[model samples]
Target: DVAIVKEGWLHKRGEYIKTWRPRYFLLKNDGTFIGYKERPREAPLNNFSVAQCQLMKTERPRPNTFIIRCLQWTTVIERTFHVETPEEREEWTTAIQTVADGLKKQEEEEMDF
Candidate 1:
């Protein structure tokens, strides 16, 4: 229950110029996905719920990239990330989507914390 579903480096596209930089991501079993600029030590660049995200694989984005979209301040934010390999991308994408959908379903039944 306390384990992480996935934790590794993914190349995140910058908000400017579409540049990619390696970022550390932790996809926890708690249905939270957080990212850091580097490894486990840096403060989180993003700490948001995976359950609130809509993920999709985009062929036009990069050679191996996926998108995660979420609402922030009444606007949608889409972040693209490139992975090292296709198989690994599939694993991470599916795992994230699985956790996101699963938690959102439970969220509908539970009271807000």
Candidate 2:
């Protein structure tokens, strides 16, 4: 489960208004989402687990951009990433959904024991 699933650059929304910064995102098979401002240059900004999380594609006001929401533990924790292109968004959503579904199946199998 340590294999890398996807890795690429995406624009992450900042706390301040109109601030969208570039972040290098790494998705691992272990259901972790790691983000870095500068790869091998700066400290990681986010390192979180999204195991069994719910994913959704959000419609934005702007074109050529979309949002992927990762809701973990209900309303307790939620993570969102803004993707610039349709292809990238599709790739990420598919990757996340596959991982999450795998986790769900594993959980169900464990419960049968």
Candidate 3:
């Protein structure tokens, strides 16, 4: 299935917050192709696109550059699917959410904001 857009993913820190693009990433960790279907920017969640990977509010700090860890796994041997079930999605999401547990960063408030 097609996954990941050529562009990076966008996210917000709070409700009705500003959206920012963190960084671009590949679905696989070791430079392997993982998915086969891409989704439009309109609705990335529940779809088989890299955009589907959204960061939790605590994944990174607010209003700055950050790294998001997305924990995804193959349901089938190849990890191909039209869409992930809610349970599977939640598992991946939680895994990603917890990745922020021990991450450290430099949070300088840019005057440009």
Predicted candidate 2: what Cα RMSD to the true structure?
2.6
Model 1 local distance difference test score:
0.83
Comparing 1 and 3 on lDDT, the stronger one: 1
Tens-digit lDDT track of model 2 for 1-113: 28989898878766455567888989888888889987645668978776767776675654344444555445555555677677878888889888778778888999985
List residue ranges in candidate 3 displaced over 4 A: 1-82, 104-113
- Backbone clash pairs in model 3 (N, Cα, C under 3 Å; residues 3+ apart or in different chains), count: 6
lDDT, model 3, position 63: 26
Task: Rank candidates by lDDT, best first.
Answer: 1, 2, 3
Q: Which stretches of candidate 1 lie over 4 Å from their true place?
A: 111-113
Give a tens-digit lDDT track for model 3, residues 1-113.
43322232333222244443232223432122222224223333322332223353222233232333344675311121211244443444444333322121111232334
In candidate 3, position 10 carries an lDDT of 31
- Candidate with top TM-score is 1
**Which candidate's lDDT is highest?**
1
